[PDB]
Design a protein around this ligand. Sequence first.
Ligand code: MG
Ligand code: MG
Ligand code: MG
Ligand code: MG
Ligand code: MG
Ligand code: MG
Ligand code: MG
Ligand code: MG
Ligand code: MG
Ligand code: MG
Ligand code: MG
Ligand code: MG
Ligand code: MG
Ligand code: MG
Ligand code: MG
Ligand code: MG
Ligand code: MG
Ligand code: MG
Ligand code: MG
Ligand code: MG
Ligand code: MG
Ligand code: MG
Ligand code: MG
Ligand code: MG
Ligand code: MG
Ligand code: MG
Ligand code: MG
Ligand code: MG
Ligand code: MG
Ligand code: MG
Ligand code: MG
Ligand code: MG
Ligand code: MG
Ligand code: MG
Ligand code: MG
Lengths: 36, 169, 159, 294, 208
Amino acid sequence: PPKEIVKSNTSSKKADVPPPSADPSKARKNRPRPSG
Amino acid sequence: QNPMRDLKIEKLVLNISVGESGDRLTRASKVLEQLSGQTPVQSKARYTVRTFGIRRNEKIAVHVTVRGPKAEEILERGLKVKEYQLRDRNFSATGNFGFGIDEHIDLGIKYDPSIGIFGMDFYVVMNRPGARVTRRKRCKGTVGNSHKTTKEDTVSWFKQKYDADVLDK
Amino acid sequence: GKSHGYRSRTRYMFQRDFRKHGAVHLSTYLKVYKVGDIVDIKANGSIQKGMPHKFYQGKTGVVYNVTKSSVGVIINKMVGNRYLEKRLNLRVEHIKHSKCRQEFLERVKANAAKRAEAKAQGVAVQLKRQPAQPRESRIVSTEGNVPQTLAPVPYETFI
Amino acid sequence: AFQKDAKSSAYSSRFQTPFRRRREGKTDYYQRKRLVTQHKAKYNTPKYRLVVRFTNKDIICQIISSTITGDVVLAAAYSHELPRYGITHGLTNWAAAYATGLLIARRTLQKLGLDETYKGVEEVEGEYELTEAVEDGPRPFKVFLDIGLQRTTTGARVFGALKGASDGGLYVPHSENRFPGWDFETEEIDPELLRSYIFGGHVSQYMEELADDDEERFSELFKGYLADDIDADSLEDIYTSAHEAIRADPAFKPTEKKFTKEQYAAESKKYRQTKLSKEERAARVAAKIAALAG
Amino acid sequence: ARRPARCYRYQKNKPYPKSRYNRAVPDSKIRIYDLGKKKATVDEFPLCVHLVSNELEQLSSEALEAARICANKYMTTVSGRDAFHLRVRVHPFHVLRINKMQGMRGAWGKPHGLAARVDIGQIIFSVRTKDSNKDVVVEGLRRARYKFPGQQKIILSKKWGFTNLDRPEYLKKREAGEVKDDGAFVKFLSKKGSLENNIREFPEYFAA
RNA sequence: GGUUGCGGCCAUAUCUACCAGAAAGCACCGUUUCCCGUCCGAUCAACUGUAGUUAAGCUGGUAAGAGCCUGACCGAGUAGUGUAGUGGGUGACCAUACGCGAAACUCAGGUGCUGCAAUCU
RNA sequence: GAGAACAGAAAUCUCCAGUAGAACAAAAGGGUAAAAGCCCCCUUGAUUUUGAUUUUCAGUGUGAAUACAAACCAUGAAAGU
RNA sequence: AAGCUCGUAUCAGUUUUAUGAGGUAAAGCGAAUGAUUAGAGGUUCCGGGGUCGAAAUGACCUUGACCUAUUCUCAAACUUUAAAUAUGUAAGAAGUCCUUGUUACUUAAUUGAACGUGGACAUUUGAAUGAAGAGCUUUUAGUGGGCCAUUUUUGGUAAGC
Ligand SMILES: [Mg+2]
Ligand SMILES: [Mg+2]
Ligand SMILES: [Mg+2]
Ligand SMILES: [Mg+2]
Ligand SMILES: [Mg+2]
Ligand SMILES: [Mg+2]
Ligand SMILES: [Mg+2]
Ligand SMILES: [Mg+2]
Ligand SMILES: [Mg+2]
Ligand SMILES: [Mg+2]
Ligand SMILES: [Mg+2]
Ligand SMILES: [Mg+2]
Ligand SMILES: [Mg+2]
Ligand SMILES: [Mg+2]
Ligand SMILES: [Mg+2]
Ligand SMILES: [Mg+2]
Ligand SMILES: [Mg+2]
Ligand SMILES: [Mg+2]
Ligand SMILES: [Mg+2]
Ligand SMILES: [Mg+2]
Ligand SMILES: [Mg+2]
Ligand SMILES: [Mg+2]
Ligand SMILES: [Mg+2]
Ligand SMILES: [Mg+2]
Ligand SMILES: [Mg+2]
Ligand SMILES: [Mg+2]
Ligand SMILES: [Mg+2]
Ligand SMILES: [Mg+2]
Ligand SMILES: [Mg+2]
Ligand SMILES: [Mg+2]
Ligand SMILES: [Mg+2]
Ligand SMILES: [Mg+2]
Ligand SMILES: [Mg+2]
Ligand SMILES: [Mg+2]
Ligand SMILES: [Mg+2]
């Protein structure tokens, strides 16, 4: 009903691809985890 | 010296991240409108993930920024649910701070099962007088060092009013 | 397949001059070109319209036309065993007044002076130009400077 | 500041400074190109710019031409002179610009001889008009709208100093839709509203609601209005007759200047530090190593 | 299968380095260029000796590698595995092309191996020890002489260790406060730079 | 001399850290009825110059600062190069004759200059 | 880089740094920072008349391009484009 | 080949002077980009290992990354700097200066632009050197497989390729 408002992304990247910081290799193993 | 430099909250920005769009997103917007009275701004997913069940530009999450006294109500209204204790992190060496809370009901705000429960990301921006010097158009410039907001200057300032406790290490 | 496009080989020619990129200082647009001026032609890569062809870089010419943004220049290009007259339309970003003529006029003005200044003095002018003339006789003094004698040096390694 | 944010020797070395007036955020050069550049086949004919600058509460209106040695001021009018013509209050407002634009329009038109001819609009019903060309006569002096960095917003008061210069006899090309009263959802103007802003009809009608609604504010802002005994409905007269007084005597009184050149300088150098000598710096170094040795 | 060394001896073609217009090249045959005691402090090994190339020619990786091994192995087992620091001053950056076994039609090569373009008076092998050791160093270069094409002559360095300074100029720099150890090398006291942390480092100066 | 508006060249002007800055001018700063712009009067707009402040911006100074600029028989007449020989060398190459002449290095000096207008103890 | 519930190496929010290390369909190389990049608004000049010009060059053609003239338009406060 | 218009004239595979262009050689890498050897010094709430451990946003060893000052060595398709040889234009009568006409272009403007009437300025007409000359037109033959030498340089192990 109201006009939705969407944020303007100054970044110039058209590619639907994850950035380099996003990689399987960082991934601390045995991270805290829930239990119980 | 400190005549004009005291401190002020520049803005508060509430945030709701949600793994989709559709109903669940709009409700979370309804949450932030009546919480700010302002009508809020959604964001779009910057790329596709699919382990989060999201695609690029899928309208993932809403937020709203608040300035003025009407923030300090919603800040303190929030600092209540966190029981006036934050951490030594939560504070950015730039001088800001933020904290999250599950259950938006926990501050004012009746239930309405046709809305549901959402969490928020409360983040607070601290600047000073002379904070337009890096904001305005003409002669855009950069706050001198001695005037910049720091973590030390912000924590002590959070310690005193609000009375609250910084804790941790 | 071989290649020649209009801008071929111009990589380093049209390149923007280190720490000098970006928009163009306004004195360029300020200068006024009257027909018949002597122009130097140097491209400015930032200005893609009204751009001289790579041949005419470094060339000097004279302006036959004056339009809105651009002075039309004629250049005599050599092709084969003759020169043909060629006509270039250049924006003044790419042009600069040539200082070749600078000394000339200054000498012209200088010459008319020395003329009326010597003539109103009873002539004896000699206003043409001379090549460097062999040195004159001179004495040189040994007082306080005795000749310091020199010897070639023996070979050394030092590495 | 932050030790890991660091300008490397390379950074400095290969940094390319923007110009100067670009670093100071003062000049948008891409607008200065498109303004200043003369059609090359008009040769030395200067392009003249209408320079409307807003400080904090002083209005700077200049007609300036351009030269590779430096830009050159033909005529200069400020709002701080407006006390001469009967305005001591609200020198930063839409009506004070219109007033400072009619002062610049008729100050140049005066020393330019276009004075007696081309009187612009002396009526001011706030209609849209550019000063027309007189049949068999000189053409209206042309000057163009240098906004500075000001944002183009319908109603903004840079266009006040415009409408005071275009109703004041100069030929400054413009359209209607940056003017208060511009209708958004149909192309139209209401002159009535625009007229009002020329004499301050928003600032009075603000004073009007603030006497009977909140006088606390009305006692804080609008202080000098009481201190001078000037209430709301009289604002239009103050400006109406200042227009008259302006066309009367545009001639520019400078101030009586009170301490000449040599004086102002002799006092200003007491506060301005004078650098050093290498031998002294050299002695500083030989001294600091002496001290910082032990 | 390795083409005899006479085909690539001379610098006949512009440098053909491995690059993105290349990519296909095999590994270099010499890999490690620093041997002996490479952690040695600048003051440990004052004496320096050079193998200098007197020709303008090309030296194959496999030839570097084999005069590396030679000169090291002898120098170690004669004066002992830490007696010296042997650093190879030359790197094989040039890809050599071969035309495999068309006709001569379409003859552009494919990377056959690597080598290093060497100058006249260019140092190839540099070694530092105690002056006590010179004849062991010298012979150890001398025995790597045989593994290389061309005229290469050994040279006694006017300088201190691997440094840029002659022996006297090193003492005067070291016996005043100007010299400060780094791991295999040194850093030096400059008369330029911020006086604050200029005195932080080299605190041993500033007395005289 | 200081300052502001418009500037010319566009680092001797930029950068980092301090400190000093009278007068004016800038600046921050006060409000939200009006035109206007926003998720948000932060920016943009409008009103006030009042209520408050030199805190920042800005100006300048400090610095064996970074960088930039300039200079030198500093390196170096080196590298490279135009011209020549029935010059040396198996060759790679290299000396000589007649001219041209770098870059890096090092030393020393420097840290914006100024136009048009209005200002200001 | 430092920061904030679920939130992880990557989701959305905020600051500080940031000469371009990005982006401009595509090949490469130029070029570009209050833009030539990113967002939005309005438009259709990607039009009409026929010459001159540069590249290839025989100074033919063709493709591509450059500056004008005359119209009729777009956009913008305007200079302009 | 035919001539033709002329004749102190314009003229040049050359120099000097003045002023422009260029990015090769060399140079550079404790300058960008890309490569590349070795140490040293920092930094992890955080790559992975161990020891202490209920654990920790725990302490300590440790290995990898980054960071900061360094060090050896490189580039046809890298670069701040940047040659030599070659390269554009200028060195006057078609010139310089005064005065003030024409217009439908252009300026706020009889402003400016373009072409002008009229007037003044002389010889050593504007550096060197050379010149028997210079400019101009028509027509038409053969030819349209080249090869070699020094230097520059591509492919190739090379080749009398
Ligand atoms: Mg985007
Ligand atoms: Mg970003
Ligand atoms: Mg090709
Ligand atoms: Mg260049
Ligand atoms: Mg185009
Ligand atoms: Mg603009
Ligand atoms: Mg065999
Ligand atoms: Mg070859
Ligand atoms: Mg041998
Ligand atoms: Mg003051
Ligand atoms: Mg405010
Ligand atoms: Mg505003
Ligand atoms: Mg202070
Ligand atoms: Mg300062
Ligand atoms: Mg310095
Ligand atoms: Mg022989
Ligand atoms: Mg020589
Ligand atoms: Mg110095
Ligand atoms: Mg400085
Ligand atoms: Mg680029
Ligand atoms: Mg724009
Ligand atoms: Mg169009
Ligand atoms: Mg064509
Ligand atoms: Mg084509
Ligand atoms: Mg190059
Ligand atoms: Mg090239
Ligand atoms: Mg080279
Ligand atoms: Mg270099
Ligand atoms: Mg490098
Ligand atoms: Mg330089
Ligand atoms: Mg002549
Ligand atoms: Mg005449
Ligand atoms: Mg044949
Ligand atoms: Mg043969
Ligand atoms: Mg043959």
